[PDB]
């Protein structure tokens, strides 16, 4: 009875993480896999304290006691109501500077830095100042509120797992309108079980046709 504990940001369950876990489980039938939802920031102390062994997060927070590998970047999209003018560009995409005067829903509401830190930074990076920002608890809430007419939201491509009536996802074309997925571990040599997790990630990414790959070590 050996155990690996994995922390993850909840919204990563809309992407490739469940496939990664499922394959990892098939490869390690004797392994107990414990899954703990937590924000990226929370994963730092969880790793240092040994409450988790690896953390899937959406940014890199530097702490000397942990280390990181960039798995991949997801494209950001603009979630809009179907009646919004922006939806006419659904098949071609828009840019950050098209969004400045819109009501933007940011998320999550957990301690900073979090997903939304980078979102605001990419605006600032090009001298853009969004004039109307609201923070909500998590992405699926933001999406439901967009469908209800509450504004727009910048969301990872993976959230297209959620399809709602009159909700549309519009591509964001700025090359830096992307959001990273990181794996974080203690700053020491990975265990055999963590190395196996890396290989499982590599395998799922190979199925998706991603190239790096990814990268790794």
Binding residue ranges for benzoate: 11, 16, 56, 72, 114, 205
Angle CA(70)–CA(180)–CA(49) in degrees, nearest 5?
65
How far is 191 from 130, CA to CA, in rounded Å?
Answer: 44
- In the stretch 147-186, what mask flags binding to a second copy with x, by CB under 8 A? xxxx----------xxxxxxx-------------------
How far is 147 from 215, CA to CA, in rounded Å?
Answer: 38
Distant-in-sequence, close-in-space partners of 158: CB < 8 Å, separation ≥ 6: 11, 12, 14, 15, 16, 74
Closest CA to 21 of 10, 34, 11: 34
Establish if 105 lies at the interface with a second copy (CB under 8 A). Answer: no
Distant-in-sequence, close-in-space partners of 60: CB < 8 Å, separation ≥ 6: 68, 70, 180, 182, 184
The single residue among 4, 7, 21, 179 that binds a second copy, judged by CB under 8 A, is: 21
The single residue among 40, 52, 59, 81 that binds a second copy, judged by CB under 8 A, is: 81
Annotated binding site for cis,cis-muconate: 11, 40, 115
Establish if 140 lies at the interface with a second copy (CB under 8 A). Answer: yes
Residues contributing to the site for Cl ion (CB under 5 A): 11, 108, 138-139
Residues contributing to the site for a second copy (CB under 8 A): 10-11, 13-14, 16-19, 21-22, 25-26, 35, 37, 81, 137-138, 140-141, 143-145, 147-150, 161-167
């Amino acid at each position: 009875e050996k155990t690996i504990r994995i922390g993850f940001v909840g919204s990563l369950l809309f992407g490739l993480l469940p496939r990664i876990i499922h394959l990892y489980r098939q490869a390690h039938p004797n392994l107990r896999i414990e899954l703990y939802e937590m924000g990226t920031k929370a994963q730092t102390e969880a790793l240092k304290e040994g409450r988790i062994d690896a953390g899937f997060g959406r940014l890199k927070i530097s702490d000397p006691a942990i280390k990181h590998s960039l798995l991949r970047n997801e494209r950001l999209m603009v979630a809009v109501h179907a009646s919004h003018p922006l939806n006419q560009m659904k098949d071609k995409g828009v840019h950050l500077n098209d969004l400045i005067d819109e009501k933007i829903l940011l998320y999550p509401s957990s301690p900073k830095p979090n997903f939304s830190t980078h979102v605001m930074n990419i605006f600032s990076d090009h001298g853009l100042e969004p004039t109307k920002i609201n923070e909500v608890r998590e992405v699926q809430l933001a999406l439901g509120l967009v469908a209800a007419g509450e504004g727009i939201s910048l969301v990872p491509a993976s959230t297209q797992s959620i399809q709602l009536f009159n909700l549309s996802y519009v591509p964001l074309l700025d090359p830096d309108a992307i959001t990273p997925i990181y794996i974080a571990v203690r700053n020491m040599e990975e265990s055999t079980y963590i190395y196996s997790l890396y290989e499982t990630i590599r395998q799922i990414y190979a199925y998706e046709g991603f190239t790096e790959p990814p990268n790794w070590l």
